[PDB]
Structure 1
Amino acid sequence: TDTFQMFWLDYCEVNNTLILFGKVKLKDDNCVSAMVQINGLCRELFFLPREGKTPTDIHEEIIPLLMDKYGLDNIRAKPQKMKYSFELPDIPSESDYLKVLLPYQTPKSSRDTIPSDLSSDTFYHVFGGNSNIFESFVIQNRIMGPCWLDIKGADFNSIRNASHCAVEVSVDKPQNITPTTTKTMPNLRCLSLSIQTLMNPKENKQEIVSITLSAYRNISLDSPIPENIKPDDLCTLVRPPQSTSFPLGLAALAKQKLPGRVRLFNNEKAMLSCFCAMLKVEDPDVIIGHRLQNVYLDVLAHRMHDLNIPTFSSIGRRLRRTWPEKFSNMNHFFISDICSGRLICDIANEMGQSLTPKCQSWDLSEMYQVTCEKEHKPLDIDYQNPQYQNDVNSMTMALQENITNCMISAEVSYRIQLLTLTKQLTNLAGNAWAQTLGGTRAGRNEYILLHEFSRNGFIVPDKVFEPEKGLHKNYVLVMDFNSLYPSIIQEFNICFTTVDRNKEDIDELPSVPPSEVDQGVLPRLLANLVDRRREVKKVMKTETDPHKRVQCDIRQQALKLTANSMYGCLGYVNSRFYAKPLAMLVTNKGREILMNTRQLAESMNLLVVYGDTDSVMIDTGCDNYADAIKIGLGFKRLVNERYRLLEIDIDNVFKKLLLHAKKKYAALTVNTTVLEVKGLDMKRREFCPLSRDVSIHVLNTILSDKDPEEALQEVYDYLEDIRIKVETNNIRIDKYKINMKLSKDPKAYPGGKNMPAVQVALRMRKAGRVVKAGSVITFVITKQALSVAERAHALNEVMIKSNNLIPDPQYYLEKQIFAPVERLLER
C-alpha cells in the first residue's frame, strides 16, 4: 500500500548495477512491464586469519589499503564466525573471519577483483572476491526465484530512457527489496516466433526470409492452460528471397488463404525494422519457439547486426543504441544478455528435451505427434528454389508452413507445461528463471546449495548390466531407479559436513559417518524435498477440484526432479560443489545396491534384461498385463523392504521387446497396446515407401500374439508375395520412390557419377530443364552393363508407361528389402 510492488522475471548487469525486469499492476488491474535498477550492492568477502592473528589485525591492514585502491571514504567490516566444509585443504571447520562489504560500484578500479590467494601475514585466504552481482543480491536478500517483491524508497524520477518497459524505478540499496509470500502471479504475455531462413553460398550467411508472430496476451500459470488456445493476434512478415519484388497477386492470395495478417516488405532490413517495432509494442514477457537458443536467435541477432537495425535491443527489455564491442565462440553470452527481460521458452533445448523423453530427434513435427498426438507432415522449404520468387502459390504454401510451425511450437510448449514446471524448479532452486529455461541442471544444483549453506552460516565455494539382446516374449518392465543416489545420500548421511575426506588427495576413498554424527545439510535438504512431496501427494488423494489437483501434480514433479538432480552437485566434475571422494562413496553404494537388486530379482525367479543407475529392466515371466504389474509391485515392495528409502516405480510396460540396447529397440508398449521403435533408422530417406512398409509389417508380425513358426512363416509368405509382385512389376511406382536434396549445383558435385540423384539431374540439364541447389530429386532405380546411378530415372518419367521404364527387382529386393530386414530379423 505504501511500497512499490513488482513480480520479477529476469535480470541483467550493467555498470556494476543489477536490473530486475518484471510486471506491475495498474489501477485497472492490468499488468505492464517494469524494471528496477538496484544500486548499493556489495560483495561479502571473508578473510581467514592465520593461527596467531585475529580479525581485528586484518581490519587494520587491508581496510586502509582497500579504501585507497577503490577510493572509498569508508568500508563496512566486522568479525563473523563462519563454517567451511568444502574441498580447500588447510581451512578449518569453523573460524572467525573478517566480513568485508565491498561495493560493486567504486570510484576506482571497480572492475578489479580481489584474488583468493592475496599475499598477507594476517590472513591466507579470501572468499567471495569474485562474487556475481545477481548471485549476491539473490543470496543476501533470500530471493527464491520469480516472485512478488516489496520495494521501498523507489525513485520514480531517476531513470530516463533506459528500457522498453512501461515503468522505470531505482533503489539506492538492495535492503530496500524484500520478497512477499503471495503465491499467485500475474498473467504473462507470450509471443511465439517462427523464422524461415535462406542459405547464402557466397558469404555462408543465414539470412531471414520470413517471420511469424503469434501473440497470447493472458497466459496464466495459476490455472491450467486451455488446450488449443487461440492467439489474440497472428502476423507474418516476409521479404522476397531472390529479387526486390514479389510475384503478382500475393497480397490478395494471402488475404484469401492465410490466417492472420501478412505484411510484405521490399527487403530484409525493412522487415527486421518492423519486427523490432512490433516486439516493442507487444512487450512480451516470454518468447516461445523451436530451436531458438542454438539456431534462430543467433541468426536473428547477426542479421540485425549485419543490416544495422537501430532498434535491435527491443528483442530484450534494456535499451541499447550500440552492440557489444566484441560482437567468436562467446556470441551466446552477448545474445543471452541482449535478450534479458524476455524469457526464452525453447521447447527443443536441453530443458525442453528433458520433459519429452519419448522423443528422439525433437523435430517440430515429431514433438507435435508425441506431446499432442496430432500429425503434421513437414514441408521442406528451400528459398534457393526459384519457384518462390515467381510462383505465388508456392510462396503462400511456404508462409502457411511457417504459420503452422509457429502455432505448433506454442501449443507444444503449453502442453508439456514448460513454463510452469521451470518456474517451480526455479522457486525450489532459488536461481533465475532464464537460467532454468536455457541452462543445464548444474545451475539449479548450484543455487539450491548456495541458498541452503549460506542460510546456515556456511561459507560457500567461489565460482551396469549388459542388455540381453533378442526378442523377449514375456512382459518386460522398466523400473525407474532415478531416486537411487538421492536415497543413498540420505540413508547414509553423506554430506560435505559429515564425511571426513583427504582434501590433499581426492582419489582416496572416504567412509560413511557413524550413526552418532548428526544429519548433514545435504541429507537434511533431500529429506525435506521428499517429505514435501508426500505432503502434496496426500493432498491430491483428497483434492476434488481439478485445477488445484493439476497444480499439485506440477509441484509434485518439480520436487521429484529437484531431488533426483542433487547428485550432480557433488558428481559433476565442473560443479561448484564437486567432491570426488563423495561421488565415489555414492557410486560404490550404487553398485552394491544394483548388484543386490539383481539377486533380489532372481530370488523372485525374475531375469534382469538390462540395468543401470537410472533404470532396471526385468522380465516378469508373464504373458498377461495384470500378472505383470503384480510382479512389478512385488519387486517394488521387495526392493523397498531391503532399502526403506529406495522407492522404485514401473516406468514402461513392454508386451513384447526386441532389444539391442537401452535406446535401440522395438517393442509393444502399454498405456491400449502400441508399437514403439527407438534408435533404429526406420524413417530413413535412403529407403523407399515399399521398404518402409515391409519393415513395419515384418515387425508387427514378429511382435504379434502368435507362435514363432506360424508367424515367421507369415513373414516368408509375405516376402515371397512381395518378391513376385516386384518381379512382375505389379506395385505402384510411387512405392519405389527415393528422395535426395541437392545442397549445390549438380555440376558442382565431385563424384556425381556415383550419386543417382546427381545423374538424374544432369540428365534433365542436358535435355533442357533447369535444376539448381535446393531441388529435391525423386527417382527410381530402373531395370536395364549400366551402373545403379546411370539406371536411376526421375519418378514422373518412370510413371509414364510408354517410356518403357520398370523398377529394377535386383536393387530393390536386395538393397531396399533384404538388407533392412536382415538387420531387423536376426534373432
Structure 2
Amino acid sequence: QVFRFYWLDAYEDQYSQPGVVYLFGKVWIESADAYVSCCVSVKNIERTVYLLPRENRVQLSTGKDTGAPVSMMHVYQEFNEAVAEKYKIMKFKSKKVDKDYAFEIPDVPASSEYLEVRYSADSPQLPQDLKGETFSHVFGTNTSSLELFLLSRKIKGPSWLEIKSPQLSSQPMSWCKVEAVVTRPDQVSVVKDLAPPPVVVLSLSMKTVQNAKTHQNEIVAIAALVHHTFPLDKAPPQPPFQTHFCVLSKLNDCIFPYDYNEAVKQKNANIEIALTERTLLGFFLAKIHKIDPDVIVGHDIYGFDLEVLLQRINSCKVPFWSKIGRLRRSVMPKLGGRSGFAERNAACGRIICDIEISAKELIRCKSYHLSELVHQILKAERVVIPPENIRNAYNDSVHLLYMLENTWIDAKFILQIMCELNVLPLALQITNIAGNVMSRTLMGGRSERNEYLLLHAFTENNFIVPDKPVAAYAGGLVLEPKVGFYDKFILLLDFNSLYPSIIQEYNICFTTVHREADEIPELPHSDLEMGILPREIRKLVERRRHVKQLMKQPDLNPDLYLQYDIRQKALKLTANSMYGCLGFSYSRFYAKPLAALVTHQGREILLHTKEMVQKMNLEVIYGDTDSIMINTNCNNLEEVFKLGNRVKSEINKSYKLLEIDIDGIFKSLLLLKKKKYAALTVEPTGDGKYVTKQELKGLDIVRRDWCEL
C-alpha cells in the first residue's frame, strides 16, 4: 500500500485546477523488475494565511486608537463575522501560532501571536492590503500551491517520497504507466538515505527548412539518442547512448531520387521514412510516448527546437499533442512569453536540458554555438550543412543519407557535451542544496535558488516569509596600482570566501541588523546568536571546502579533477549569489542595507590589511576588494614563502573566521591598469624547483571583442 517513489519534477496550473500539484517520477515494479514513470496528484493543498493582531482596537481606521485590548478571540470573531461573509468563504479552520518575523514591512514585531486560517483553494483569494478592526496585516494571500506543499512537507529537491494509503484514478490523467492520487498533503513524507534511481535520457536534434511563402520553419529530419539507465550520482555511461531512432520526411514539393528505398534498405532498418510532415510529427510523438524520457536534452531546445515543434504540431493538427509532455490536456499553452516557460509547460513533467544555458552557466567560451562548444569541450571538428543545401539535397540518396547522418552526429555531440560537464549530477546537487525544482535549476538563473534556500531556512526555523513580489550602494575597494614591470617575486595574499566569512564573523543577518526604511547600518551586537543567513552561508562554505579537499587528493585523474573544479566554482557562485540577492531590486529578500554593510566591512578589512603590511615595512602595489600584492624585492623563493607565512599569520591574528592565504607567487609581473595585468605564476614541484605558468587577467588578449590575429 505504501507508495515509495523518486520524484523528479512538479507541475501546477494555478488557473485550471486549484490546489492540485502533479509530481512526476520513477517507481519500482517487480513484474518487469525495472523502473517505470509515475504521476502522483496531490490534492487539496489548502490556502494558509496569517493575520497579525493589533495592540489596540481601531474603529476601522476611522476613530483611530480606541483603547480596547485585542486577543486572538477578537481576531477570530472579526474574521468569522465580517471578512468571511464579505469575501464569500464558506468553511475554514483557524488556530493560533507564535511566529517570528524580520523583513521589510514596518510595524511588524519580531515575535507575535498570529492567527492562522486554513481554507480550501477553491474559495476566492483575500486581498493583500486587507485591514480590518483587530488585525493590521495579512500574510500569505498569494502563496502558490507548490510552494506551500514543498515548504510544509520539508521537501528539498528530488528525493524518495512515501505515500500512505494512495488511491487510484477514476479516469486516466497522465501518459505515464503508474498513477496515484493523494487526498491530503500530510500523506506524503520524505525518506532519507537512499540512492537515486536511473533516469531515461533522450538527446534530440532537428533539421528543418524555411518555406519562404509562409516564413515558417518546416521539419524535414529528426534524430534521437536514448539511454534507459543514465545515472544521477555516478559517472556518465560509456557509450553515452544505448539506442537511437531517426525519422525523415519528404518536403511538400520535392520527391525522393527514385533510390531512397534501396538506400534505406542497405543502410539500416532504424530510419523511418514518411511522406508528409504530419506523419513525421505523429511518429515522433508516438516514439516519445513509448520511450517516456525523464530528461530531454538538446541545443537551443527552449528557443528554436520545441517552439518549432509545437508550431508545426498546431499547424498540422497532429492529434495527441500532449504526448510531448506527460499530462493529458486539451488546450495548448499560449505560444510566446519570456524565455521558454510556454515551452516548459508544453513539456510539463519532463526535464528539459538546453546545453546552451548550462554551458553559459558552467564554462566560459568565445561563442556558445554548437560548433564552438564541440570544439572547446569535446575537441572535435563539426561539419556544417549550409541552410540552402538541405533543400537541394533531395536529389540523390547519398546526400539525403548524409544529411540524416549529420543530424545523428549533432545529436551525439549534444549528448557527449551533456555528459562531459556533468550537467545532470551537478543540477541535482544544486537543486538538493537549494530546494527548488530541477527544471527551474536547469533553466538557468540564480535568484530562484537563493530564494528557495532562504525560504526553507526560514520556514524550518518558525518564521513568516515575505510575500512573493507581484550602482545603488558602495561596493569593493580597488587600490591605486603602481603600474609598471616587476622582475622579482610578487606575493599575492587573498582572503578565503571574503563576504561569506564577513557575514559569519560579524553576524550580519535579517534578524541581527536593525534596518530602517541610504546609510550604512551599525554592526550587530556580539551577544546575539547566529542567525539563519550566516548559518546557511557556513554550510555552503563547508561544502566547497570539502570539495577542495577532494581536489587536493594526490594522483587524481585529470578529467575528474576538472569536474571537481567546476563543482567548486558552482558552489562559490551560489554563496556569492546568496550575498548579491540582498541587493537585488526584484528579489523576494531585498535588504539593501545589509548588503551595503557587507561591502563596507569588506572595504574596512582591506584598508586595515594594507595598513598592516605597510607597518611591516613591505610594499603594497595592488588590491581588488579582497587581495593584496606585495613586492617581496627578493629572489630566494624559500625566503619569500617564509615571509608569506609570517604576514599570513599576522593578519589571521586579528580575525576569528576570516582567513588569508597565498593565492600565488608571480616570478614576473606586468601591471598595466586597475584589473588588467599579466604574470608568470610559480607552481613549486619540490626540492626548490618550480614550473612557471602564464596567467593573464583583464588584458585585451583575453577578450572576445578583438580580432584573433
Deviation at 1:383, TM superposition (A): 4.0
The separation in 2 between residues aligned to 1:44 and 1:231, in whole angstroms, is: 46
Where does residue 500 of structure 1 map in the other structure? Answer: 514
Where does residue 116 of structure 1 map in the other structure? Answer: 128
Contact 2:302 2:343 in 1 (8 A): no
The separation in 1 between residues aligned to 2:630 and 2:211, in whole angstroms, is: 53
Where does residue 327 of structure 2 map in the other structure? Answer: 318
Q: Deviations over 1:399-430 (max 9, x none)?
A: 33322221121112122111111111111111
Q: Deviations over 1:32-59 (max 9, x none)?
A: 0001111121122101111122322221
User: 507-516 vs 639-648, which deviates more?
Assistant: 639-648
Indicate how the Cα distance of structure 1 residues 417 and 49 shifts in structure 2: closer, same or farther if over 3 A, else same.
same
Structure 1: 5+ residue runs without aligned partners?
A: 685-691, 696-827
Q: Structure 1 counterpart of 2:21, which letter?
A: L
Deviation at 1:237, TM superposition (A): 2.3
Indicate how the Cα distance of structure 1 residues 509 and 667 shifts in structure 2: closer, same or farther if over 3 A, else same.
closer
Pair 1:679-2:696 in alignment: no
Three-state SS of the structure 1 residue aligned to 2:102 is coil
Map 1:475-486; keep pairs closer than 5 Å.
483-486=497-500
Pair 1:517-2:522 in alignment: no
The separation in 1 between residues aligned to 2:490 and 2:211, in whole angstroms, is: 51
Indicate how the Cα distance of structure 1 residues 241 and 490 shifts in structure 2: closer, same or farther if over 3 A, else same.
farther
The separation in 1 between residues aligned to 2:251 and 2:635, in whole angstroms, is: 59
Where does residue 279 of structure 2 map in the other structure? Answer: 270
Q: Structure 2 counterpart of 1:354, which letter?
A: E
Pair 1:168-2:176 in alignment: no
Deviation at 1:571, TM superposition (A): 2.2
Where does residue 355 of structure 1 map in the other structure? Answer: 362
Pair 1:333-2:341 in alignment: yes
Indicate how the Cα distance of structure 1 residues 555 and 379 shifts in structure 2: closer, same or farther if over 3 A, else same.
closer
Q: Structure 1 counterpart of 2:457, which letter?
A: E
Pair 1:243-2:253 in alignment: yes
Map 1:521-600; keep pairs closer than 5 Å.
521-531=532-542, 560-596=572-608
Q: Structure 2 counterpart of 1:97, which letter?
A: Y
Q: Structure 2 counterpart of 1:243, which letter?
A: D
2:49 pairs, out of 23, 45, 63, with: 45
Deviation at 1:354, TM superposition (A): 2.2
The separation in 1 between residues aligned to 2:313 and 2:180, in whole angstroms, is: 29
The separation in 2 between residues aligned to 1:211 and 1:475, in whole angstroms, is: 58
Indicate how the Cα distance of structure 1 residues 176 and 544 shifts in structure 2: closer, same or farther if over 3 A, else same.
farther
Pair 1:193-2:204 in alignment: yes
Pair 1:78-2:95 in alignment: yes
Deviation at 1:440, TM superposition (A): 0.9
Where does residue 380 of structure 2 map in the other structure? Answer: 375
Deviation at 1:366, TM superposition (A): 2.8
Where does residue 473 of structure 2 map in the other structure? Answer: none
- Two-structure CA RMSD over aligned residues (Å): 4.0
Contact 1:381 1:398 in 2 (8 A): no
The separation in 2 between residues aligned to 1:250 and 1:630, in whole angstroms, is: 75
What fraction of aligned residue pairs are identical, expressed as a percent?
Answer: 39
Where does residue 151 of structure 2 map in the other structure? Answer: 139
Q: Deviations over 1:166-194 (max 9, x none)?
A: 11110110000000013311101011112
Pair 1:95-2:112 in alignment: yes
Three-state SS of the structure 1 residue aligned to 2:501 is helix
Q: Deviations over 1:776-827 (max 9, x none)?
A: xxxxxxxxxxxxxxxxxxxxxxxxxxxxxxxxxxxxxxxxxxxxxxxxxxxx
The separation in 2 between residues aligned to 1:622 and 1:366, in whole angstroms, is: 44
Deviation at 1:651, TM superposition (A): 7.8
Which protein has greater RCO, CA pairs closer than 8 Å, 6+ apart? 2
Three-state SS of the structure 2 residue aligned to 1:362 is coil
The separation in 2 between residues aligned to 1:339 and 1:651, in whole angstroms, is: 46
Q: Deviations over 1:57-103 (max 9, x none)?
A: 22112235565567665311111111110000111111111101122
Contact 1:571 1:583 in 2 (8 A): yes
How many residue pairs end up in the alignment? 666
Contact 2:224 2:245 in 1 (8 A): yes
1:32 pairs, out of 29, 36, 50, with: 36
The separation in 1 between residues aligned to 2:247 and 2:654, in whole angstroms, is: 62
Indicate how the Cα distance of structure 1 residues 481 and 534 shifts in structure 2: closer, same or farther if over 3 A, else same.
closer
Contact 1:277 1:311 in 2 (8 A): no
Indicate how the Cα distance of structure 1 residues 70 and 596 shifts in structure 2: closer, same or farther if over 3 A, else same.
same
Structure 1 length-normalised TM: 0.71
Where does residue 445 of structure 1 map in the other structure? Answer: 450
Where does residue 744 of structure 1 map in the other structure? Answer: none
Q: Deviations over 1:343-382 (max 9, x none)?
A: 1122211x4422213x23222233334334x222341531
Three-state SS of the structure 2 residue aligned to 1:566 is helix
Indicate how the Cα distance of structure 1 residues 596 and 176 shifts in structure 2: closer, same or farther if over 3 A, else same.
same
Three-state SS of the structure 2 residue aligned to 1:270 is helix
Indicate how the Cα distance of structure 1 residues 659 and 385 shifts in structure 2: closer, same or farther if over 3 A, else same.
farther
Structure 2: 5+ residue runs without aligned partners?
A: 57-69, 469-476, 684-690
Pair 1:7-2:6 in alignment: yes
Structure 2 length-normalised TM: 0.82
The separation in 2 between residues aligned to 1:526 and 1:114, in whole angstroms, is: 36
The separation in 2 between residues aligned to 1:195 and 1:636, in whole angstroms, is: 57
Pair 1:426-2:431 in alignment: yes
1:149 pairs, out of 139, 144, 161, with: 161
